[PDB]
Design a protein around this ligand. Sequence first.
Ligand SMILES: Nc1nc2c(ncn2[C@@H]2O[C@H](COP(=O)(O)OP(=O)(O)O)[C@@H](O)[C@H]2O)c(=O)[nH]1
Ligand SMILES: [Mg+2]
Ligand code: NA
Length: 170
Amino acid sequence: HMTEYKLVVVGAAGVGKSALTIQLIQNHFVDEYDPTIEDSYRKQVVIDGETCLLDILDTAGQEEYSAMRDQYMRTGEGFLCVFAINNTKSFEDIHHYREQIKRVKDSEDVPMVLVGNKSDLPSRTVDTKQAQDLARSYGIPFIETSAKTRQGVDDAFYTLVREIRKHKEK
Ligand SMILES: Nc1nc2c(ncn2[C@@H]2O[C@H](COP(=O)(O)OP(=O)(O)O)[C@@H](O)[C@H]2O)c(=O)[nH]1
Ligand SMILES: [Mg+2]
Ligand code: NA
């Protein structure tokens, strides 16, 4: 009685991958989540009249190999590619995350959303138009989030589900 959607959250250390996932699931902002915990979470939610079971991998620790992450990259249906709007380097890093996904899928048409997180912080070094340019180039949506205030968080995830449906029958 539910449709499963396999989602993968990627991006540089410290951008708020865990914070966004935890906010989606618990409606809580977690100040201090272990940067090393990689794991999958489940969320049941009704999106456009369909009862969805989201199966979400919150990735961590790019440095080392991971059997879980390997399985999710190969079989994941969509990707949230996250940078922080006060972390220029994380924005610059998006290129590499996107290339890695393109390679695993042997494809340039992969359901993905570019997410610019920490929108509540005043120290903004990546402008919305830089992000809009980058997403336009990739042919993907751009959404600004705050895992702290929850602004944009459901939007990011609902939009990814919709991009998955645009790509394949579910
Ligand atoms: N102010 C603010 N801080 C955030 C936001 N998202 C995450 N953080 C903080 O940024 C740091 C890294 O978040 P975390 O989720 O562990 O990042 P991860 O390494 O990508 O999983 C933590 O202190 C979080 O409390 C946000 O939207 N706003
Ligand atoms: Mg994390
Ligand atoms: Na959170």
